[PDB]
Amino acid sequence: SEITYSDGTDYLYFTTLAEAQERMYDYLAQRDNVSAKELKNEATQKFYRDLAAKEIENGGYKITTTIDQKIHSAMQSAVADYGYLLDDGTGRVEVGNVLMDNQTGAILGFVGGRNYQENQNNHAFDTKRSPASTTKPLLAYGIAIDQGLMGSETILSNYPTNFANGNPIMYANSKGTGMMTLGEALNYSWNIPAYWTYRMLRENGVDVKGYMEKMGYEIPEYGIESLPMGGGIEVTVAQHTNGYQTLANNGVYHQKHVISKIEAADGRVVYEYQDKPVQVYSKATATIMQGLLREVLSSRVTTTFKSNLTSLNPTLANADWIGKTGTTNQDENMWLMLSTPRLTLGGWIGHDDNHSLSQQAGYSNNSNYMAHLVNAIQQASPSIWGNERFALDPSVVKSEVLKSTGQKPGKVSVEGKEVEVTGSTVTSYWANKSGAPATSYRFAIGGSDADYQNAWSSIVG
Ligand SMILES: [Cl-]
Ligand SMILES: [Cl-]
């Protein structure tokens, strides 16, 4: 009886064992005609779990995993040789990563932690943590866009503002600034605009959990004001990677999996992964979203990745990389999600007890560690990342708008009066029918009464 890697023959052992055990259980139960309401009985369960365990250690099944040998060993050397770059002064830094194919959900290789021998917790598949700002594309902007409430150069308020509970909304030490583009909101990861976006989605009662649940996310309370910043959410790196699989495969989710097939010795098929593809964001949204995340990495505001990788390997650095970082407040978790059109790679770092990493752990160390990781992968499989490009889908609507309001040039009721509105203008990619609408008084997403006049008697004379 033998577990096989994609072609041929440590956390990997356990993790596979366990999925495979689970499946055998479903098959046994069902080959025995064990009834709907019998399998609820605990005792029957324990007999079947134990029976599946046994069928597998002594019955000669051929278990086929999606895992790629060369890749997954390279991801282990890479964490053995370069794991120490994660160590930032706050003790041993733990780490989890998952590589995934964007067309299939197949998981090709992962890193369960620094060293299975010193610490057995699986951080790729079992440690579960808030994702912080990397929630914002899935949950706030890609939805707003996909629902026609925004396009790529719409404006958003980052003026100081408060939670329901009175407290002010921070970004590090900043109480906030002024108005700003989606781009700038994404690249810096400002929290206020994100707050305002999710607030808008509630105001229109959008079916936000219809989106999240279609990628397999489990969030218990959708009404959290910090949700888009990651309050009220917790995920493993593997589930979360599958959320970035969705944005990268033009919005078609494919469910994450490790096992493709289990065959008895004589070919009977005990179990087969059966693709269940689901169109979560329109193609227009996912592609306008690709364009945005291309600049989160190029602009290097919240990660140094494009720099460390250009130096490690200039030609891979020119593949079409997109993604997003996250930092939970207090700095206990750092995330980097990366994608090329072919692959997604999720990475988390943190401490098993939850204390603090250093300020730069996400920004510099995980960024450079991931650059090594992404190198070791390509160096082991030179074509795997691909040389393809993310492209706006033909169905994106290109609209014609003002750098300054994000809406079409037009005239405004400037609180009793009138101005024809101008300055130079910029392309906006929209995922609706029709485009930007004509400018208006409340042009920006979110914003208080006070500030729409701070901003309008300014974005004038
Ligand atoms: Cl670049
Ligand atoms: Cl840099």
From TrEMBL:
Write down the chemical reaction(s) this protein catalyses.
[GlcNAc-(1->4)-Mur2Ac(oyl-L-Ala-gamma-D-Glu-L-Lys-D-Ala-D-Ala)](n)-di-trans,octa-cis-undecaprenyl diphosphate + beta-D-GlcNAc-(1->4)-Mur2Ac(oyl-L-Ala-gamma-D-Glu-L-Lys-D-Ala-D-Ala)-di-trans,octa-cis-undecaprenyl diphosphate = [GlcNAc-(1->4)-Mur2Ac(oyl-L-Ala-gamma-D-Glu-L-Lys-D-Ala-D-Ala)](n+1)-di-trans,octa-cis-undecaprenyl diphosphate + di-trans,octa-cis-undecaprenyl diphosphate + H(+); Preferential cleavage: (Ac)2-L-Lys-D-Ala-|-D-Ala. Also transpeptidation of peptidyl-alanyl moieties that are N-acyl substituents of D-alanine
Alphabetized, the UniProt keywords read: Carboxypeptidase, Cell membrane, Cell shape, Cell wall biogenesis/degradation, Glycosyltransferase, Hydrolase, Membrane, Multifunctional enzyme, Peptidoglycan synthesis, Protease, Transferase, Transmembrane, Transmembrane helix
Keyword match Cell wall biogenesis/degradation: yes
Query: Does the record carry Transmembrane as a key word?
Result: yes
**Which intervals hold domain Penicillin-binding protein transpeptidase?**
98-330
One GO cellular component, as annotated: outer membrane-bounded periplasmic space
Q: Which GO terms describe its biological process?
A: cell wall organization; peptidoglycan biosynthetic process; proteolysis; regulation of cell shape
Source organism's superkingdom?
Bacteria
GO MF annotations in UniProt: penicillin binding; peptidoglycan glycosyltransferase activity; serine-type D-Ala-D-Ala carboxypeptidase activity
Recorded protein name is Penicillin-binding protein 1B
Which organism is this entry from?
A: Streptococcus pneumoniae
Traced from the root, the source organism's taxonomic lineage reads: Bacteria, Bacillati, Bacillota, Bacilli, Lactobacillales
What fragment of the whole protein does this chain represent? 106 to 788 of 821
